[PDB]
Structures are given as C-alpha cells and as structure tokens.
Structure 1
Amino acid sequence: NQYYGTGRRKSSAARVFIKPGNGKIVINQRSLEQYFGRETARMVVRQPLELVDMVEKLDLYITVKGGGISGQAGAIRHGITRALMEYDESLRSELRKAGFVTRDARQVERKKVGLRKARRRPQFSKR
C-alpha cells in the first residue's frame, strides 16, 4: 500500500509517495539532509502532517522539478495533502477546512495585446 499525490506552482512540478511505516523523508533519489535544513519556517513541508498529527507514523518519498527553490517546496505542499487525504476518511474534511485541499490560479496569465503586464491600460490627464 502507497498513497500518491502531485503539485504545481510557478513553473515548479512535484510528485509524492507516502507509506505506513517508520518516520523518514527522502527527495530526488538523494538524502533530504544534503540540501534542506536552512528554510526559515518550513511550513510547506510540515503543516499538513501537523494537522493529522502523524509525527513518525508515515514514510515519505518525494520527486520535484522546475522553477525556483521556494516554489519547489510550495508545490510539495499540495503533494503532501493529495497523498494524505487517503490516510483516513474522517480527515478529508479537516485538510479542506485547513485550506490545504483548495488551489488558486493567481499566478500570471497569457499576455493580452498590447498591455505590458496584461492588467493595466495607458494613462492620461486634462479634459
């Protein structure tokens, strides 16, 4: 048995597997300790697992690609929710009320001709 989930954020794309077992976390075929451990709050890799209070009951495996190092971790937040909704049926509503199951399209869309950044029009003054 393995739970599965994916996540997308500003050119970053993640996929995550979770098993019932001893408390480990591994990433990109390597050890997590080799480039994670300096992130100022690490909420995006903790807060869904803190809501289900699992501590060390789940074994995690991650793969991530694309974009900047902050959005790579923000994309993993959706993977560690979609791979976690399968852990117990009575927790499906709790992760949803916590705002972790919802997504948004606020990251910028295709350019509208000729508007420089698609949301502002040229200025004027006088009559």
Structure 2
Amino acid sequence: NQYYGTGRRKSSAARVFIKPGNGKIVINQRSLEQYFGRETARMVVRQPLELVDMVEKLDLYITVKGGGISGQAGAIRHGITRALMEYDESLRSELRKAGFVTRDARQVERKKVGLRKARRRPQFSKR
C-alpha cells in the first residue's frame, strides 16, 4: 500500500515513503529531531505537509544520502511532495503554487581555469 516519491536537491537523494498513520517521521532510522538538529531543515521537511493538512494523517519513512544538511532537507521535501502527488493527484495545484514540485536545479558551478573559483577572478592590476 505504501506510496513513494524520490527526492533530489544539490547532491542529496532522498527516498520518501508515505503510509497512512499518526504522523511519525523517521530519517535513516532516526527521528526528525535527532537527524536534523537545525530548525530550518525541520521546517522545510514539514512545509509541504503543513500546506496540505495531512501532518497527523500519514507516517513517512525516509532514507537520504549525499549533500549536506540543508540540501538533504530540500531533497526530502521534494520527495515528500512527489509522494503526495502520487497519492492524491488532486493536491498538485497547491504544491505548484507553493513551489515544491519544482526540482531546484541549482548545482555548484564548476571551478574554471584562470579563475580562483566559479566566478572570482584573481586580483587585477594595470601596474
């Protein structure tokens, strides 16, 4: 019965499963409060659920790999959104409005020869 959505953001890759239940979130066999020490991360993972009143209605099992914390959180959120879409298919519009269906395609820009970074040019001088 369990529904599913893949999450991806920066170099993170979340695997969100939605099930009907009480609303307990497990991320890599750890609680939401344990895994994400950051409040912002927590908020981002809860955002979609908040938007469509199904926080108490459904449990979700997650496993996430790659990236840092914020990126991971984003990925998770994306996955959740996907799952929701799969599951209801009538909440899509709301999600779209929110801006959660959109895969955030922003990757880190590669370092470029000549430059110290993606865009930082070295210090110039006429003399």
Q: TM-score, normalised by structure 1?
A: 0.79
Q: How does 1:87-126 map to 2 (within 5 A)?
A: 87-121=87-121
Unpaired stretches in structure 2, ≥5 consecutive residues: none
Identity %: 100
Q: Distance in 2 between matches of 1:120 and 1:37?
A: 32
- Equivalent pair of 2:27/2:35 in contact (CA under 8 Å): no
Specify whether residues 93 and 24 from structure 1 end up closer, same or farther in structure 2 by C-alpha distance, changes over 3 A only: same
Specify whether residues 81 and 40 from structure 1 end up closer, same or farther in structure 2 by C-alpha distance, changes over 3 A only: closer
Unpaired stretches in structure 1, ≥5 consecutive residues: none
Q: How does 1:42-57 map to 2 (within 5 A)?
A: 42-57=42-57
Q: Distance in 1 between matches of 2:96 and 2:118?
A: 32
Structure 1 or 2: more helix by fraction: 2
Specify whether residues 43 and 109 from structure 1 end up closer, same or farther in structure 2 by C-alpha distance, changes over 3 A only: same
Task: Name 1:27's counterpart in structure 2.
Answer: 27
Task: Name 2:9's counterpart in structure 1.
Answer: 9
- Equivalent pair of 2:14/2:64 in contact (CA under 8 Å): yes
**Alignment RMSD, CA only?**
2.6
Once the two structures are superposed, residues 44-75 of structure 1 have per-residue CA deviations (whole angstroms, 9 ceiling, x without a partner) of 11110011111311111000122322322222
- Equivalent pair of 2:10/2:105 in contact (CA under 8 Å): no
Specify whether residues 110 and 37 from structure 1 end up closer, same or farther in structure 2 by C-alpha distance, changes over 3 A only: closer
